[PDB]
Amino acid sequence: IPEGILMEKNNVDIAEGQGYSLDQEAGAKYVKAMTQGTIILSYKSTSENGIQSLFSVGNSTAGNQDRHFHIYITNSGGIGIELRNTDGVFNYTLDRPASVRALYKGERVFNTVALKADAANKQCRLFANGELLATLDKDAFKFISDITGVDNVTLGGTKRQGKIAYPFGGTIGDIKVYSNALSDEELIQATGVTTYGENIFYAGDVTESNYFRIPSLLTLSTGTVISAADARYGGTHDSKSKINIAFAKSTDGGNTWSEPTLPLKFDDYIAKNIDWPRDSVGKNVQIQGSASYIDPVLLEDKLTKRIFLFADLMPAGIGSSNASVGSGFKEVNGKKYLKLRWHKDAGRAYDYTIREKGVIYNDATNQPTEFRVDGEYNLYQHDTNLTCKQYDYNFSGNNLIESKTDVDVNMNIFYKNSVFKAFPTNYLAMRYSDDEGASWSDLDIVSSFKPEVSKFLVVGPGIGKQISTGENAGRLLVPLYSKSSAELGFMYSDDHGDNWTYVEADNLTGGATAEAQIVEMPDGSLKTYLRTGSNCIAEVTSIDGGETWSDRVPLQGISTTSYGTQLSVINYSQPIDGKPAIILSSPNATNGRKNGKIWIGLVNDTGNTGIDKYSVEWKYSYAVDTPQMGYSYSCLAELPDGQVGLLYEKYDSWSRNELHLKDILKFEKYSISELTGQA
Numbered sequence: 244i245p246e247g248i249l250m251e252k253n254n255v256d257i258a259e260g261q262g263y264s265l266d267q268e269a270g271a272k273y274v275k276a277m278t279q280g281t282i283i284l285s286y287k288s289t290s291e292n293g294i295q296s297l298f299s300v301g302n303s304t305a306g307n308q309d310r311h312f313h314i315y316i317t318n319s320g321g322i323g324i325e326l327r328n329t330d331g332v333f334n335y336t337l338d339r340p341a342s343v344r345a346l347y348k349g350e351r352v353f354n355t356v357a358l359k360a361d362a363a364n365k366q367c368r369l370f371a372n373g374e375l376l377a378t379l380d381k382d383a384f385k386f387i388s389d390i391t392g393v394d395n396v397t398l399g400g401t402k403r404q405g406k407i408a409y410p411f412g413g414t415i416g417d418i419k420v421y422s423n424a425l426s427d428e429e430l431i432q433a434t435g436v437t438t439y440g441e442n443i444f445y446a447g448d449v450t451e452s453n454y455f456r457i458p459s460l461l462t463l464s465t466g467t468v469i470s471a472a473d474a475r476y477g478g479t480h481d482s483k484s485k486i487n488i489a490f491a492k493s494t495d496g497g498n499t500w501s502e503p504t505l506p507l508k509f510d511d512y513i514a515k516n517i518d519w520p521r522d523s524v525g526k527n528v529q530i531q532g533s534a535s536y537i538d539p540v541l542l543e544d545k546l547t548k549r550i551f552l553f554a555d556l557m558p559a560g561i562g563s564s565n566a567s568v569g570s571g572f573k574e575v576n577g578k579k580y581l582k583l584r585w586h587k588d589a590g591r592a593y594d595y596t597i598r599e600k601g602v603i604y605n606d607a608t609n610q611p612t613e614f615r616v617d618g619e620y621n622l623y624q625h626d627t628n629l630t631c632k633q634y635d636y637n638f639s640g641n642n643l644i645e646s647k648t649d650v651d652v653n654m655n656i657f658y659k660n661s662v663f664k665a666f667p668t669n670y671l672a673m674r675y676s677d678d679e680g681a682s683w684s685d686l687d688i689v690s691s692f693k694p695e696v697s698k699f700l701v702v703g704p705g706i707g708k709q710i711s712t713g714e715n716a717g718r719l720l721v722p723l724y725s726k727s728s729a730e731l732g733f734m735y736s737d738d739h740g741d742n743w744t745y746v747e748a749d750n751l752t753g754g755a756t757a758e759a760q761i762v763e764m765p766d767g768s769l770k771t772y773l774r775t776g777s778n779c780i781a782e783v784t785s786i787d788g789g790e791t792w793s794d795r796v797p798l799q800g801i802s803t804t805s806y807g808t809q810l811s812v813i814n815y816s817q818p819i820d821g822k823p824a825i826i827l828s829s830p831n832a833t834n835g836r837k838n839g840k841i842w843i844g845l846v847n848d849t850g851n852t853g854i855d856k857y858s859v860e861w862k863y864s865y866a867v868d869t870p871q872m873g874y875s876y877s878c879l880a881e882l883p884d885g886q887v888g889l890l891y892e893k894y895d896s897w898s899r900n901e902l903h904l905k906d907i908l909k910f911e912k913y914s915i916s917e918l919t920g921q922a
């Protein structure tokens with residue numbers, strides 16, 4: 244077998260189910276006997292077939308259907324390989340979901356992938372569109388030379404008992420088969436020739452996080468575009484994990500982004516890039532004793548130009564599912580104060596409170612102690628900053644070991660080893676900035692209003708909303724949801740963010756994940772669209788600046804799942820078809836978070852008054868990709884030019900098979916012309 248390129252072919256159109264024979268190529272005899280090597284190919288799929296082999300080498304005869312090697316893609320964007328010679332001999336597989344795409348801006352696009360079979364290192368590696376997707380290590384390294392009775396080299400399918408299996412339909416732009424193992428660097432470069440959309444946050448940036456979720460995107464009145472997202476360190480797991488909130492901005496209309504910062508973060512557990520296991524056992528494991536921030540909301544007060552960042556604050560080892568019922572506050576002298584438990588007291592004995600100037604008081608004696616906290620909630624004893632050891636987390640087999648290191652960090656009331664511990668429920672935190680993220684204010688825990696009967700009261704991620712007209716012009720609103728007397732809720736401020744008031748929008752006690760986003764009508768009234776626990780997106784209306792809301796009404800015509808997915812709905816500044824317009828983003832499948840679509844809803848005045856004054860006609864829908872392509876949480880923003888920016892999760896964030904995937908948070912831009920089918 245010679246060194247280098249054994250075979251190369253360009254521009255091969257493959258009719259679905261027909262495949263293409265490469266048996267007559269000069270190097271077929273070499274390819275049929277490869278001991279190792281590299282395969283790189285550019286392709287465009289025009290087929291909806293579930294599994295589509297791009298390239299394969301194997302035995303096509305009767306009874307030998309499990310003897311073959313193939314690189315395939317799925318209609319849902321997955322990519323992988325299967326190296327087989329019947330299960331008793333070997334069956335090596337490697338794959339990674341949501342690695343490739345099918346359509347972009349209404350047209351089928353090319354993806355570039357590569358498989359590297361490194362005999363020297365006994366390792367197999369998959370790449371696609373500039374990324375190293377997965378790695379398989381095997382003591383008993385195997386390749387094509389190990390398959391019994393190879394008799395064919397095929398493009399667009401795998402020959403099994405004389406039939407074309409895993410049928411591809413489309414075009415193989417180029418394929419190159421090397422006998423040598425090219426370097427990862429060469430493959431990153433080679434496959435990187437085709438990329439769509441861009442990343443704001445990514446594995447390898449200064450956040451030190453390998454994973455990101457929950458996008459927030461907002462264009463400021465100054466023209467600057469800002470963004471935030473969960474920087475999920477311990478895989479893509481929801482809280483009761485180690486998660487910080489990342490932030491970045493663009494001053495050129497969303498073309499390039501700044502080095503990300505971490506405005507909301509905890510230091511009890513170290514922030515580091517770690518590859519979380521994706522096997523059936525390890526994938527379910529999550530960090531047990533870390534404090535975290537989760538689900539960001541960005542908001543701008545156009546009057547003061549101040550920006551705010553909100554997120555849920557989870558004490559050590561807490562998430563929505565295991566939060567304790569209670570406000571986390573205690574009322575003394577008529578004022579609500581954060582309550583604390585001295586570590587040496589009884590398990591449920593919260594006999595202290597954080598009062599004015601962070602001074603900690605003994606509630607029984609009503610006397611101040613020698614302790615206090617600063618604007619970051621870090622402990623001080625007699626003016627000396629208290630510290631404790633930071634934890635590290637590593638996998639030992641399928642077990643996650645969380646252990647102390649020798650690194651000292653400031654002792655915070657939300658840390659598991661703090662001498663004074665906060666009540667284990669969730670909190671609502673925020674910081675403001677007057678210089679577009681150059682600096683942020685002290686930590687402001689605004690959840691003093693959390694109902695004492697509530698398990699959790701959290702934010703609806705995305706952006707908040709400021710009323711532009713009417714009697715409540717200037718009011719700031721942030722959507723919330725909870726497990727208590729009400730599900731949907733809101734917090735609003737009439738003094739530009741200094742103080743907040745909580746509003747219950749319904750009397751539902753089920754605690755469903757009612758994530759919502761707010762949009763303003765021409766007269767200043769508001770319409771809130773939300774995810775529900777039923778098979779539809781609901782709409783509620785307010786005619787009093789968000790103080791009271793109408794009953795939920797199904798959003799007719801926009802399909803969704805029973806469990807639901809967060810949505811993004813925004814106001815657009817210019818009319819579309821001569822009418823005020825709103826734009827909505829959400830996955831459209833009735834099962835699985837896939838088939839994302841951007842809808843344009845035209846606001847019509849019905850002629851009625853009050854809650855029934857307006858009616859939204861969802862006139863246009865725009866499919867972001869093909870039906871099976873993953874699409875989960877998202878956030879829309881009108882950019883300074885006419886365009887609509889979209890930061891979204893390009894994978895199924897619900898699926899137990901698509902957890903812990905890197906670089907799935909993408910940023911794309913669309914013109915109204917494109918969105919309305921006009922092109």
Ligand SMILES: CC(=O)N[C@H]1[C@H]2O[C@@](C(=O)O)(C[C@@H]1O)O[C@@H]2[C@H](O)CO
Pocket residue numbers: 457481482537538555562563701755756808896897
């Ligand atoms: C505070 C919090 O846990 N937010 C979560 C919830 O929504 C998501 C989801 O993808 O559906 C992701 C969010 O980050 O999973 C959670 C679950 O649904 C319970 O609401």
